[PDB]
């Protein structure tokens, strides 16, 4: 197995595992260390931190993004899900 190095968003499962590993790689931890249910404001995220991951995320998905999604889906399980609606 080798799932820890970006894929493509075809399903909310892809978008979750992207967000997760991209959390892992910012935090210098495991992907399995990431709570997709815990609020991001208590992880590595901050204020500026968002735009870094966002400007990767939108491009990975082929579009733009907006900061409201942090302020609305501040967890992988909700963010990835809503991305599965805005995009998928």
UniProtKB/TrEMBL annotation:
Organism domain of life: Bacteria
Protein name, as recorded: Asl1650 protein
Organism: Nostoc sp. (strain PCC 7120 / SAG 25.82 / UTEX 2576)
């Amino acid at each position: 197995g080798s799932h820890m190095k970006t894929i493509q968003p075809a399903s909310v499962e892809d978008i979750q595992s992207w967000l997760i590993d991209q959390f892992a790689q910012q935090l210098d931890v495991d992907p399995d260390d990431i709570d997709m249910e815990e609020s991001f404001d208590n992880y590595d995220l901050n204020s500026s931190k968002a735009l870094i991951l966002l400007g990767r995320l939108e491009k990975w998905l082929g579009k733009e993004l907006n900061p409201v999604l942090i302020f609305n889906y501040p967890t992988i399980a909700q963010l990835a899900k809503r991305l599965g609606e805005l995009y998928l």
